[PDB]
Design a protein around this ligand. Structure first.
Ligand SMILES: [Zn+2]
Lengths: 48, 97, 98, 148, 144, 49
């Protein structure tokens, strides 16, 4: 009903942000994938 | 460029400890400033430095195994490093057994 | 560098192995040293009597210096003739191994 | 003139209840430290096996989650906090969750630390905070957190 | 009361004492204590020492230059070195997270507001938001 | 039957290796783009097997 307006910003200020270090752990994980094109040799043509 | 490609590192300068024996010219086995090494160190200075070619060269000998290798670094401008200066990289951890 | 002091060196003045431009940091067993206690003249160092048998160490800055230990690709030549009344011979840069 | 209190997503600590829910087939959401947040599920039908999906949102008619077979580890469950996917949501990412000890300024200009026992929201989406020993509900700006 | 602590509030007083040349003790977080000092002579600059014990014939302090940050001084607690007390033998330190029960048998958390003792050595503690005193047993040390 | 005979074999075995040195051992990146905050990632080691 009411018009949709941007309004004001909400992000607060942050100071002295420290880096993230990957934590060592013996526990298992799952490796986040990327699905995309694969490159391969033309082994048949290599035989030729 | 250097601040971009570098890694945060603590730079502490080196200087001969006063504890050196005046006659033999060799150091005390234990003292607060230097732990047997004949060279003491100043307070650290936070610094960004680039590092390359890092090598963990292992030599197996009758005395035992020994870790020694070459690592090539490149500093910022206006910094005049000296021989046997010391650096430590808290971020990077090394496995040993 | 580091030096050992004795009752004789205190008066003569310590002969330095290097030259001097300025001193960065001095120290001894009793701690650091201030400008009020030491002086340098003609590239040798004097100390007051408080450090008769103490050790002294210094971090020092000195001017860069070099000597020519070989001359390499020693001569390169050009008969420059363009825009000259007559042919002229010019010696191009030498390379030095310092 | 407000909205009723909003429950926080209770983490599950006991492995036994986790396994029971999994056997029932209810979805689980695992906060992996190294590689983000993932969903865990038991395959339907006779061929039982665990499945994972990174389609990290509530299921919707226009957004159907895809499940990949994975050999989920017990240690992963134990060391990583796990939540029921029916609860864990973007609805309220409150800066000061329930049972958190926070520092609040009292009227006598003396800073005190109290544990948040109840949290609710209002029309504007604000976060009203209830602290033990006091009836008036504080606001986000007034409070402060002390860590370590 | 106990005379084991006399923290400085204003940084201006800290600088005034540094001008006078008196040594200071500066605490740290999960880290060794520090002593700070102003160098004598012509050139004025800050100096620090990792040692803490009193100077003696068998023990001498070591001083070196350091670019001390005013942030540390203003934030961290500061004392006069000569008048500092090593420890007050109490179970709970000042400004420590503790748990207790209110007058209506309701559990509540707080930090220690004051550390007190009687003439017989019995220690009483006052918490924030609680005027009354609490026994050592009645308190509980909250785990981080 | 082969009490005092000789025997010879042509055999297939799995490939195996051990790490005899670690070379160009650590390479690093402060990845910051499209992150809430700066993150440190260890890039691939090279091994001399
Ligand atoms: Zn030494």
């Amino acid at each position: 009903e009411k018009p949709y307006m941007i309004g004001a910003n909400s992000n607060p200020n942050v100071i002295n942000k420290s880096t993230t270090y990957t934590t060592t752990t013996q526990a298992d994980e799952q490796d986040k994938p990327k699905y995309t094109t694969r490159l391969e040799f033309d082994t048949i043509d290599m035989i030729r | 460029f250097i601040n971009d490609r570098g890694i945060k590192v603590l730079w502490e300068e080196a200087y001969f400890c006063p504890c050196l024996n005046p006659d033999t010219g060799h150091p005390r086995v234990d003292c607060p400033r230097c732990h047997g090494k004949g060279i003491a160190y100043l307070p650290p200075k936070e610094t960004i430095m680039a590092i390359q070619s890092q090598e963990k060269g292992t030599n197996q000998l009758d005395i035992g195994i020994l870790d020694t290798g070459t690592a090539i670094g490149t500093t910022q401008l206006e910094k005049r490093i000296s021989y046997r200066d010391r650096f430590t990289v808290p971020e990077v951890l090394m496995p040993q057994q | 560098m580091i030096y050992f002091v004795n009752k004789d060196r205190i008066k003569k003045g310590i002969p330095l192995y290097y030259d001097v431009k300025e001193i960065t940091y001095i120290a001894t067993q009793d701690g650091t040293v201030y400008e009020e206690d030491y002086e340098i003249k003609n590239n040798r160092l004097y100390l007051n009597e408080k450090y008769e048998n103490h050790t002294v160490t210094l971090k020092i800055l000195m001017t860069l210096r070099y000597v020519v230990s070989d001359i390499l690709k020693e001569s390169r030549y050009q008969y420059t003739k363009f825009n000259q009344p007559k042919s002229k011979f010019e010696n191009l840069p030498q390379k030095l191994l310092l | 003139i407000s909205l009723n209190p909003i429950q926080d997503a209770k983490p599950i600590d006991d492995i036994v209840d986790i396994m029971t829910y999994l056997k029932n087939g209810k979805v689980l959401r695992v906060k992996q430290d190294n590689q983000g947040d993932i969903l865990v599920r038991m395959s339907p039908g006779k061929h039982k096996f665990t499945e994972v999906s990174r389609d990290l949102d509530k299921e919707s008619f226009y957004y159907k989650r895809h499940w990949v077979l994975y050999n989920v580890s017990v240690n992963s469950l134990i060391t990583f906090d796990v939540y029921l996917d029916e609860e864990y949501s973007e609805t309220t990412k409150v800066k000061y969750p329930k049972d958190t000890i926070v520092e609040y300024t009292r009227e006598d200009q003396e800073k005190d630390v109290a544990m948040i026992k109840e949290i609710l929201t209002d029309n504007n989406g604000n976060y009203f905070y209830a602290l033990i020993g006091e009836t008036m509900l504080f606001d986000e700006n007034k409070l402060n957190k002390v860590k370590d």
